[PDB]
Every structure is written in C-alpha cells, then in structure tokens.
C-alpha cells in the first residue's frame, strides 16, 4: 500500500546523518592513514603544539601508530573493557654526544574507539560523547549593555586554550584592556610593542592622555606585572601555545574579512598583529560609518558546532603536558641507568586524563540506545553545556533572555523541554555537509542541478520557502521568500535562471531535525504540543509486535537503516539460511554467515531483538527486521483503533481507556533486561563464596532450582527468590542468650556463615536469558583487585500493560491507563468491532491545540479502505484529501451491510435525527446519503456495550497511533514500611533487600502544620523518622497491640547538638524555669 502524496522530491535526506560522530573519528583523527598527511588537526597538531618538553637533555616527538585493539568487540561487552585501541609514537632523544636513541614509538598506551554504529563503547557501556557550541573566534566588540559606550570583546582559541582580552571605553581611564582576568590602560600595552608615539598616532587614531608612559619599549613590561596575580608576558601573545587562534577559520580567517587584512597565527606575537586591526577599527567604527557591529546576537555565523574531534582531543593537548612537567621531574632525579626516551613517557598520566573522560565527563550521557532512533538523536542533540562555559541549571547572571530562539532554521524549535531548556536540541536533516567542521551549513537549491550551502550564514539575496511551482517555475508572482529574519512578501527574483542566489526550502522537512519530521500532520498543532512529543518518541518500547503507522513519512526509509537497527546487504544476492539464529549469505564475495542479537542487553531495558524475513533467494535491499521495526518501515508503536468522546469520565483531566482485548492478542507487551551484579571480595576475617549449600535456611526452595550456586537457565523467579546464594564466614554478632534455648530446643545446632545471599530485589518476577561467571588471576578477568568472582546473572521480563503505564501519541497526548475493559462493554460498532481505544477530548485538544485527528479520520480509511499512507510535512495531506479518501471508503463499508444484510436501522437512523437539529446532517435522501456525510469527517453511528443504546451524536473514530512510553509502573514504584533504617543519617535509606525512601522535606511539612496535626506532624521526626528507641517503641508498640506509641525523643538533632558542640558551643537543653536545667540524652 504505497500511497505516495509528496510532490517533487529532490535531494536525499543528507546521506546519512550520523556524521557529527564519525566527523570526529577520522576527518579529525588521522590514524588509519599515512603518518605524513593531515596538517595539524586534532591529534597531529597537539604533538607539535606541545613543545618537546624541555629540561643537552632534549626529547623529540615523531610519528604515531595505532589500531591493533587488544580486545576485539563483543568480548568486551561479555566483560567490560572499552573497545580501546592503543597506539605509540617514536621518541628520539637529543642531548650531548651522538644524541639519539630513536626508540620503538615508546610503546605508549591505549585509547577508546567509535563503532561504525555511531556511538562509543566503555567498560562495556556503549555510551556517547555529544557536541558543544560556543561563540566562535574572531572579534565581537559587543553592544555596551552597561552605558552606551561601544567597546570590544576579544575571543579565545577555544575555551581550554587562551586568554579573554577586551578594550573598554570608560572614563577614569579611556580604555582599560581586560586580559582574560584583568583590566588595564591598553595604551600601556601598545607602547611595549614598538608602536608607541608618532608611529601609531596620526597614522591611525582619552588617547595617549597618559602618553607619559609612551617612552621606552620596556616601561610597562614590568610595570604591568605589578598588578597581576600577587604583585605572564611569555604567553598572552608571544610565542605559540596560549594566545593563538587557528585551524583555518576564526582562529585564523577572522580578521582577513572582518578586521581588514593581514593575518598571523595569534595576536601581538613584542610585534603586534591584531591589537591594531582591532582598535584602528573601533576608532573608525565608533562614530564613523562602517557599522556592522553585529553582536553575536547568538547568530550562528558567530557560533561554532564542535565535532568531538576537538572536544576531548583538545583536552588531549592538556594531558600530553600533564606528562611534560611529569617527566621533567625525570631529567633531574634518577641516574641515567634510569634515563631514556622510554623511561619517562609512562602510560599513567595520559590514558588517565582521558579515561576519566569518556566514563564520567558529563556530556558522555551514557547512550540512550532505547529505540533505534533516540540513540541516534544523541549522536546529535548538541549543547552549549558541559565544561565549555555556558553552564549550570537555571541561569548564571544571564540564561533566560539568552539562548532563546535565534536566527537559525538549521534547527528545530520543538525539542528541548523546560528545565535546562534551549541549551539542548539537535541539528537538522539537510545541515552540515562538506564544511560542518566550522559553523553549520544547510543545503540550498538554485533552480536546477546545482547546490550550495555557505553555512547557515547566507543572508545575502534571500531565499524562497518551497511553495507553488511547475517544472522549475511557478507563477505566484509573489515569491514567498525570505530576507534574514523577517518575511517580506516576495519579489520573484525574475529568472528561472537560478534562485535569487539561493532560494528553495529544497524540501519542507529541512527546517526540523529528524526526531520531528516524523509526525503526521506536524503542521497542525501547537509548537509545545509537538515538543511534548518530539521527545516522547525519544522514549518508546519494543512492543515486539511493532506496526509502522498508517500515517507517516517514508523517512523511516532511513531512521532504521542509518541507525543500523535492522541489518543490510552487499552487491550479489541469494539466501539459503537456517533462520533460527543466523542468516544465509550472499553470492558475490562468497559465503558469509550472519549473527543477530538474541534479545541482548540495552542500557536501560529495551532488550533488542532481531527476528527476520526471507525463505530462499532475493537480493532487492533489506535483511532481517529491527528491534522496533517492520519491513524497513520504522515502526515504533501499535496503531489500534481509537475514538474521541468521554465515558464515565474514566478519562478525566487527561487519561486513556483500554480494552482487555488489547491484552488478548498480546498487542501491548515487551521486555527489559536487568543485569544483576553480585560479588564476594574476601576480607581476612571472613571469606565470601557461593556454595549452593546455603546455611540455616535449607529447603527445596533452593536445592531444586539454584544448586551448585548458579541457577540453570529457564527458571521462573519471583520476589525474594535467591539469585546466586552465597556464604561468608563472618562473625559480627556472636551467640545469643535465650536464643540458645532454641538452637537446641529444635536441634538445628548453630550456624557459622551469615546467610548472605542475593535474593531478587523488592520485586521482579521473571525468567533467565542466562548467567555468567568470573574470577581473579584469569587473563581476561579485569576484576577489581583484591577480589575474586563477579557473578552476573541476567533476567528479562515479558512486560505487559496493567494499569498505569503511559501511552501517548505523536501529537502530544500522554496516556495513563484508566480501567481497561472486558469486551462486553466498549463502543460496539454496528458491525461488532468495538473501539479498542478511547481518548476523550479536553486537556490538550481544545486546550494546547493540535491537528492529529486527521490521523483518525483518514485513519478509518484503513481498517476499511485497506490502504496505509505517506503524509509529508507542510505539503500534501489536507482537509479535502481525506474527503476524496473518505469517499470510496463509505460506499465500501456501507456497501457490505447494504449488500450483506441491512441498510439503515432505528438506532443507526434515529441519531441522524439530532444530526440535523444538531447542526450537521442536511435533510436529504433516505438515511443513506445522510448516514454517509456523517462518515467523511465525523464517524458513523455507534452504540454502547453498557446499556446498549446508541450514542446520540456523530461520534468520531479511527485507528491512529498509540506508543506506550518507558515510564511504566512496575519500574516506577517503591512501597514499604520500616524497611530502610539507615545509620550515620539515622534516617530511612537502608536494606540489603529494600531501598526506597520518600522525602517529606519542607513544604510537605508546612502544608501539614497548616492544620493541627501535632501528634501527626511531630509523629514525623518522632517515631516514624529518627526516635531510634522510638522506632522499636513503634513496631513493638503496635506489633504488641493497643497503645499510643511512646511520646518522643529526636535524634538527628541530638546529632546537631554535638555536631554543633563540635565547635566552641554548648546546648544546655535548658529546663522550664531557668534553674531546672535539663541536658537530656546523656545516657538513659
């Protein structure tokens, strides 16, 4: 059912995204390429930009070598170990006589990698970097927010690599340069730069009002050092390492077009380089004519998207330096026996300043590989957050009026959220090709077979916005085009002979990311509705059944593929196979087996499988399904039927109502895999192990299932069920009194190894996809030293859908199961078919508006009409369309019945009555005609499995889309009693079984005292909180029976007291009339 709608398709969805990623690894990371090419870039640079660490006594940096991963993939995931790939680099030493020892690359260390996939692998935790942005190099000048006094704002090479210079235009000093962290008479500078008096003045330019200090080329040298750190000129300009901007743009090509002409490779190399092209300008800028003081204004022609190949590689410089002055402490100590270009460079300060990266460098955002998509988005997302300065939650100084919207269509405006808003989103389809390396660049169309995208900066000559046409030229006569930001009517450039230097949306979708261009009438809802949607999709669930939406955009042609969910192919064809687990081959380059998945672990539960398709021989070009997938069509949810209206308000505020039948055919269900890490170190007092001979408690409950420690695969498990029983010698609380009166009374003698076991957490009845054992001294076992064994059994759970999980659609409508119905009830279509799903209006429909619905009506033209459809964005799929479609549909449906048994019934008819009086149906032909219309838009009759009457009103119905996000219930719940009981805190949060909590902290309080819940308010901080004795006084109290459990005695306070008395204080818990004086607590 390939119902194509989208007219005129040109370029392809920028084959194929997943660039930001690779874009780093390779394009920036030479490596698997000759040791000769690649200018500096990323790694090649650093090395040279890293002076051969000085003390003869002179080291040298020569060539690299990598690859050869000591631990091929998978293995690692079976254990941990990042799929790191070690390197080295030849280092010949220089010094006195015959200065050389050119050692074997100085067998350096390892460095993690990126799987073609489009992510990373660390300690067996496939995670992700993520990009960072920031005002990009050059010169700003900035619009004086203080008091209208236009000055300047100088850049940094990048954050972690330079000073922030500025040249004020104040009063009590006409221009106080601000060096990174500083402020001084810029004039006291230029002096010590050759250009002082006569050589700078009258040639270019409050001036030298302090000319008194424009005499000798050294005056300020020192004179300046006297006001900086304590009462410097080595960097900040001189040499190349600190104040040096480069690459080839901004770092460099900043002046060459903005300042004037005359580049260098930094500034004020003391031979000035830019400190002239800057002020010379502000002088002929302020008051003159050349305005263009176009402040960043967040404009993307001033912002920089940075591919990770500079995110860590930058910090790579800073590390291979945390080794420079780490080795220099080697050229002094340790005789030459202990001296060589192989006795200093150790893999202990390098790999570290990098591993302490991928694993906990924030940004890393342990990949959200949930569905196949989401994940991808991460490889994009993009943020000005992280270590670059633009940072924290809920503002610094400014953040609210800031990262607002912008002037960059090369980005969706419906992806953030609401908290650390804006500072997070994602790039878009057509965007970042060829030169993404510096500033985003959206594709552009120029009337025919040519293309351009000079960054999202091109704001010269305007552009059209994909509307009206006809073989290269429309006829609008009012070209819906755009200049900068506004939206002037037009001015048809004139000649089909190319656009007005660039004009055409090239395609609609280009405006949004990807996590967007995938929702139905995504041109029919509030922005924030979509938003609260273009993130819901971020959280799906492999309902295994999948479906691929009646409505949608074939972009799913990608979604899957480029994210490599399902599989692919290669030239030749012809299968064969066994299916089962693996897959046949090909013909071309010979045979070729084919692994798959086997459910596998995800980084949260997804548990991704890969059932497949085929039977014999066909090569286009797909191959075996995906997790959440169908024949290449990115399926994510289950589009069952649906229908607006209410019912016993079991859909109040904003709720959904399911029909048990939605369980019958196990439509909604899934699976999640939780790895259970359980260990047994071994002190010296007590040695912890795993003999299936668990003490004290000996029962069939064990020996049958577990046995020999590990429990065979295919075992059903429920709460508290031992997972990997164990022992531990341990003698913490020795022999009891009366207890002895029992150890014999029954004669179970005594024990000697505290039960110590695993026992399934609070609750997780499930199965077993297997187990896994480990141990010390082993070659591949990278366990934590001082330990042995690291049992790691796996369990997944055929989910379901009880009563609580979130449903939500694609246009914004979070579910919340109400009370699933047992068939009998429901909306019984005149032909039996009940409405599997409801979704009463109010909430976000009337409120926070949307369109979707067109995903209902056109929908019914599905269970009936029998076709599925493709609905593009800001194009095709419209209000008349559905009609022409709703057409054959009715004739069809009504058809059956009219030729099957009936045509018009009391009920089915009657309604039609109001249909008129209501202000709908036209009083025409017999009930046929009228009953029709109702169709078209509104929905056919319908009755009610309750009373059985009809539903007086042209109700609405139509299979649509239901997702059922991640926020389940069995996973988002923690009920309990005393359970916790923590120490040091003396407040709940403790249990080798439980682990809940529940804060009452503040507010919750207030509102309570708002009334007189004395005994209840106090009750909290009393017994049920930290009365210790009070604790037991409780359980015991009730456990025993009736009695207003004890009054009270705090504790956390008792703490504060001493906690306070810590310092020179005291706390006479002073009593009544002064002299009684009470210091209670002191023993009892």
Partner 1 sequence: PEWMILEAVPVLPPDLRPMVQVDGGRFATSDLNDLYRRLINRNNRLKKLLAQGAPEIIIRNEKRMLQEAVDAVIDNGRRGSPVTNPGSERPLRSLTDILSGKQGRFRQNLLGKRVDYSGRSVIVVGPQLKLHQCGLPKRMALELFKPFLLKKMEEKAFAPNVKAARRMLE
Partner 2 sequence: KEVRKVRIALASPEKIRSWSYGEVEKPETINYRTLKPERDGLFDERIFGPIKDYECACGKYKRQRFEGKVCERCGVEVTRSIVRRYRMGHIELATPAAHIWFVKDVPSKIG
Partner 3 sequence: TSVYIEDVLHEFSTIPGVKEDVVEIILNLKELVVRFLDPKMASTTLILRAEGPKEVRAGDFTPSADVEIMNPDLHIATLEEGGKLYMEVRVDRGVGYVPAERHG
CB 735 to partner 1: min, Å: 21
Q: Which does 666 bind (CB under 5 to 8 A by kind): partner 1, partner 3, partner 2, none?
A: partner 3
> By CB under 8 A, what part of segment 679-698 binds partner 2?
684
Give CA separation, 253 vs 151, 246, 257, 259, in Å.
Answer: 22, 8, 7, 10
CB 205 within 8 A of CB 283: yes
Q: Which residues have C-beta within 8 Å of that of residue 794, sequence separation ≥ 6?
A: 601, 673, 674, 675, 676, 768, 769, 770, 771, 772
Q: Which two tokens stand for residue 352?
A: 């570290």
CB 989 to partner 1: min, Å: 7
CB 438 within 8 A of CB 138: no
Number of residues that bind partner 1 (CB under 8 A): 64
Q: Which does 1053 bind (CB under 5 to 8 A by kind): partner 1, partner 3, partner 2, none?
A: partner 1
CB 975 to partner 3: min, Å: 21
Per CB under 8 A, 612 contacts partner 3: yes
Residue 192 is given by DSSP the state G
Nearer to partner 1, 495 or 1007 (CB): 1007
Q: Write down how long the chain is.
A: 1084
CA geometry: angle 514, 519, 523, nearest 5 deg: 105
CB 1075 to partner 2: min, Å: 11
Taking alpha carbons only, the member of 991, 990, 1055, 993 closest to residue 1021 is: 1055
Residue 253 is given by DSSP the state T
Nearer to partner 1, 122 or 931 (CB): 122
Q: Which does 1081 bind (CB under 5 to 8 A by kind): partner 3, partner 2, partner 1, none?
A: partner 2
Taking alpha carbons only, the member of 606, 141, 714, 159 closest to residue 368 is: 606
Q: 384: cis peptide before it, omega within 30°?
A: no
Cα 738 to Cα 696: distance, rounded to the nearest angstrom:
18
Nearer to partner 3, 578 or 685 (CB): 578
CB 711 to partner 2: min, Å: 34
Torsion of CA 749, 753, 756, 759, to 10 degrees: -40
Near partner 1 by CB under 8 A: residue from 86, 646, 804, 903: 804
Element (H, E) at 64: strand 62-65
Place of tokens 């280092």: 91
Nearer to partner 2, 953 or 990 (CB): 990
CB 738 to partner 2: min, Å: 15
Q: Which residues have C-beta within 8 Å of that of residue 906, sequence separation ≥ 6?
A: none
Per CB under 8 A, 588 contacts partner 1: no
> By CB under 8 A, what part of segment 721-780 binds partner 3?
767-769
Per CB under 8 A, 878 contacts partner 2: no
| Strand segments (E) across 307-437 | none
Using DSSP, state whether 943 is helix, strand or coil: strand
> By CB under 8 A, what part of segment 273-332 binds partner 1?
none
Per CB under 8 A, 800 contacts partner 1: no
Taking alpha carbons only, the member of 539, 542, 544, 516 closest to residue 806 is: 539
Per CB under 8 A, 1060 contacts partner 1: yes
> By CB under 8 A, what part of segment 123-152 binds partner 1?
123
Per CB under 8 A, 1055 contacts partner 2: yes
CB 986 within 8 A of CB 1026: yes
Number of residues that bind partner 2 (CB under 8 A): 29
Per CB under 8 A, 1079 contacts partner 1: no
Near partner 1 by CB under 8 A: residue from 1061, 1070, 1071, 1079: 1061
Near partner 3 by CB under 8 A: residue from 489, 615, 906, 917: 615
Stretch that binds partner 2, among 86-94, 370-378, 475-483, 1064-1072 (CB under 8 A): 1064-1072
CB 983 to partner 2: min, Å: 7
Stretch that binds partner 1, among 23-31, 237-245, 517-525, 1015-1023 (CB under 8 A): 1015-1023
Per CB under 8 A, 650 contacts partner 1: yes
Element (H, E) at 1008: helix 1004-1009
Q: Which does 650 bind (CB under 5 to 8 A by kind): partner 3, partner 1, partner 2, none?
A: partner 1
Cα 958 to Cα 49: distance, rounded to the nearest angstrom:
65
CB 579 to partner 3: min, Å: 3
Near partner 1 by CB under 8 A: residue from 735, 747, 777, 1001: 1001
Q: How would you write 756-792 as a 3-class SS string?
A: CCCCCCCCCCECCCECCCCCCCCCCCCCCCCCCCCCE
Per CB under 8 A, 700 contacts partner 1: no
Per CB under 8 A, 164 contacts partner 2: no
Q: What is the secondary structure of 775-840 as a DSSP string?
A: -TT-SS--PPTT-----EEEEE------SS-----SSS--------B-SSSS-B-TTS-B-SB---
What is the CB-side half-sphere exposure of residue 396 using CA atoms within 13 A?
6
> By CB under 8 A, what part of segment 572-591 binds partner 3?
577-581
Calculate Rg over the CA atoms of the chain: 36
Per CB under 8 A, 235 contacts partner 3: no
Nearer to partner 1, 172 or 1068 (CB): 1068
Place of tokens 């300009």: 237
Burial of 424 (0-12, 13-18, 19+ CB in 10 A): middle
Q: How would you write 274-338 as a 3-class SS string?
A: CCCCCHHHHHHHCCCCCCCCCCCCCCCCCEEEECCCCCCHHHHHCCCCCCHHHHHHHCCCCCHHH
Per CB under 8 A, 738 contacts partner 2: no
CB 595 to partner 3: min, Å: 12
Per CB under 8 A, 1061 contacts partner 2: yes
Per CB under 8 A, 566 contacts partner 3: no
CB 567 to partner 3: min, Å: 14
Nearer to partner 2, 558 or 1031 (CB): 1031
> By CB under 8 A, what part of segment 529-548 binds partner 3?
544
Per CB under 8 A, 989 contacts partner 1: yes
Sketch the per residue contact string, 706 through 735, with partner 1: x for CB under 8 A, - otherwise: --------------x---------------
- Contact residues for partner 1 (CB under 8 A)? 123, 648-650, 652-653, 655, 677-679, 681, 720, 784, 787, 803-804, 816, 818-819, 969, 972-981, 984, 987-989, 996-1002, 1005, 1020-1021, 1023-1026, 1031, 1035, 1038-1039, 1041, 1052-1053, 1055-1056, 1058-1064
Residues near partner 2, by CB under 8 A: 684, 733, 983-984, 986, 1028, 1051, 1054-1055, 1057-1058, 1060-1061, 1063-1072, 1074, 1076-1078, 1080-1081
Q: Name the residues that contact partner 3, by CB under 8 A.
A: 544, 577-581, 598-599, 609, 611-612, 614-615, 660, 663-666, 671, 712-714, 767-769, 796, 798, 822
């Amino acid at each position: 059912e390939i119902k194509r709608f989208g007219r005129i398709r040109e370029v392809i969805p920028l084959p194929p995204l997943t660039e930001i990623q690779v874009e780093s690894y390779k394009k920036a990371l030479q490596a698997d390429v000759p040791p000769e090419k690649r200018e500096n870039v990323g790694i090649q640079a650093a090395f040279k930009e890293t002076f051969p660490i000085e003390e003869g006594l002179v080291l040298d940096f020569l060539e690299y070598r990598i690859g050869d991963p000591p631990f091929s993939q998978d293995e690692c995931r079976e254990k941990d170990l990042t799929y790191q790939a070690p390197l080295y680099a030849r280092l010949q030493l220089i010094h006195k006589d015959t200065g050389l020892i050119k050692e074997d690359e100085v067998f350096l260390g390892h460095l993690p990698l990126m799987t073609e996939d489009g992510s990373f692998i660390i300690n067996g935790a496939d995670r992700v970097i993520v990009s960072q942005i920031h005002r990009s190099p050059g010169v700003y000048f900035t619009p004086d927010p203080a008091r209208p006094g236009r000055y300047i704002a100088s850049i940094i090479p990048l954050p972690k690599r330079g000073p922030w210079i500025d040249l004020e235009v104040e009063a009590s000093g006409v221009v106080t340069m601000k060096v990174n962290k500083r402020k001084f008479p810029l004039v006291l500078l230029l002096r010590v730069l050759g250009y002082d008096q006569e050589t700078l003045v009258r040639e270019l330019s409050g001036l030298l009002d302090e000319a008194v200090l424009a005499m000798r080329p050294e005056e300020a040298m020192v004179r300046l050092f006297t006001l900086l750190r304590p009462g410097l000129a080595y960097l900040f300009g001189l040499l190349a390492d600190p104040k040096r901007y480069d690459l080839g743009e901004a770092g460099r090509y900043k002046a060459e077009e903005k300042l004037g002409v005359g580049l260098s490779g930094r500034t004020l190399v003391f031979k000035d380089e830019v400190f002239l092209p800057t002020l010379r300008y502000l002088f002929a800028l302020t008051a003159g004519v050349p305005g263009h003081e176009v402040d960043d204004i967040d404009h993307l022609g001033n912002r920089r998207i940075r591919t990770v190949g500079e995110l860590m590689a930058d910090q790579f410089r800073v590390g291979l330096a945390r080794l420079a002055r780490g080795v220099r402490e080697r050229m002094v100590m340790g005789s030459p026996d202990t001296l060589t270009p192989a006795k200093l460079v150790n893999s202990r300060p390098l790999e570290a300043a990098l591993r302490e990266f991928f694993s906990r460098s924030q940004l890393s955002q342990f990949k959200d590989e949930t569905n196949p998509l989401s994940s991808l988005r991460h490889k994009r997302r993009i943020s000005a957050l992280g270590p670059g300065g633009l940072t924290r939650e809920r503002a610094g100084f400014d953040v609210r009026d800031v990262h607002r919207t912008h002037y960059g269509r090369i980005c969706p405006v419906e992806t953030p959220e609401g908290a650390n808003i804006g500072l997070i989103t994602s790039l878009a389809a057509y965007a970042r090709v060829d030169a993404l390396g510096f500033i985003r660049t959206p594709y552009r169309r120029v009337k025919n077979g040519v293309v351009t995208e000079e960054v999202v900066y091109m704001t010269a000559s305007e552009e059209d916005r994909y509307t009206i046409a006809q073989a290269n030229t429309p006829l609008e006569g009012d070209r819906i085009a755009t200049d900068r930001v506004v939206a002037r009517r037009r001015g048809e450039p004139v000649i089909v002979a190319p656009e007005e230097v660039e004009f055409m949306d090239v395609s609609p979708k280009q405006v949004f990311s990807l996590n967007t261009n995938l929702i139905p009438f995504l041109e029919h809802d509030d922005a924030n509705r979509a938003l609260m949607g273009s993130n819901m999709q971020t959280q799906a669930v492999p309902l295994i059944r999948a479906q691929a939406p009646v409505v949608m955009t074939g972009l799913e042609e990608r979604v899957v593929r480029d994210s490599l969910a399902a599989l692919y192919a290669e030239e030749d064809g012809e299968v064969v196979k066994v299916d089962g687990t693996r897959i046949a081959v090909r013909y071309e380059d010979g045979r070729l087996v084919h692994p798959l998945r086997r459910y596998a672990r995800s980084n949260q539960g997804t548990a991704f499988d890969q059932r497949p398709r085929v039977r014999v021989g066909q090569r286009v070009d797909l191959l075996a399904d995906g997790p959440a997938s169908e024949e290449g069509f990115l399926a994510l949810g289950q589009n069952v039927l649906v229908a607006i209206m209410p019912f016993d308000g079991y859909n109040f505020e904003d709720a959904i109502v399911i029909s048990e039948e939605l369980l019958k055919r196990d439509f909604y269900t899934s699976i999640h895999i939780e790895r259970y890490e359980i260990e047994a170190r071994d002190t010296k007092l007590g040695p912890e192990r795993i003999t299936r001979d668990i003490p004290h408690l000996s029962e069939a409950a064990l020996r049958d299932l577990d046995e020999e420690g590990i429990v065979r695969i295919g075992a059903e498990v429920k709460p508290g069920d031992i997972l990997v029983g164990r022992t531990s010698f341990k003698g913490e609380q020795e022999p009891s009194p009366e207890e002895r009166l029992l150890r014999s009374i029954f004669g179970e003698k005594a024990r000697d190894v505290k039960d110590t076991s695993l026992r399934v957490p609070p609750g997780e009845g499930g199965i077993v996809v297997g187990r896994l054992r480990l141990r010390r001294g082993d070659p591949g076992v990278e366990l934590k030293p001082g330990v042995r064994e690291v049992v790691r059994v796996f369990v997944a759970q055929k989910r379901k859908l009880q009563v609580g999980d979130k449903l939500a659609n694609r246009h914004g409508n979070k579910g919340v199961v109400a009370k699933i119905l047992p068939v009998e009830d429901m909306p019984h279509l005149p032909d039996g078919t009940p409405v599997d799903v409801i979704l009463n209006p109010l909430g976000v429909p009337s409120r926070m508006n949307l369109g979707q619905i067109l995903e209902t009506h056109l929908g019914l033209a599905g269970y009936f009409l029998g076709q599925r459809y493709i609905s593009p964005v800001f194009d095709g799929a419209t209000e008349p369309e559905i009609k022409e479609l709703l057409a054959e549909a009715f004739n069809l449906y009504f058809g059956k019945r009219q030729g099957e048994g009936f045509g018009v019934d009391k009920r089915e008819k009657e309604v039609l009555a109001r249909a008129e009086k209501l202000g709908l149906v036209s009083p025409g032909k017999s009930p046929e005609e009228q009953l029709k219309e109702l169709f078209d838009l509104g929905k056919v009759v319908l009755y009610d499995g309750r009373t059985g009457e009809p539903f007086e009103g042209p109700i609405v119905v139509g299979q649509m889309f239901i997702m059922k996000l991640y926020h389940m219930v069995e996973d988002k719940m923690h009920a309990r009693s005393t359970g916790p009981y923590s120490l040091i805190t003396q407040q709940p949060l403790g249990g080798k079984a439980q682990f809940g909590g529940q804060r009452f902290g503040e507010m919750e309080v207030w509102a309570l005292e708002a009334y007189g819940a004395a005994h209840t308010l106090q009750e909290m901080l009393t017994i049920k909180s930290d009365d210790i004795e009070g604790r037991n006084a409780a359980y015991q109290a009730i456990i025993k029976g009736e009695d207003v459990p004890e009054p009270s005695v705090p504790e956390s306070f008792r703490v504060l007291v001493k906690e306070l008395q810590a310092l020179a204080l005291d706390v006479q818990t002073l009593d009544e009339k002064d002299n009684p004086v009470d210091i209670f607590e002191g023993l009892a």
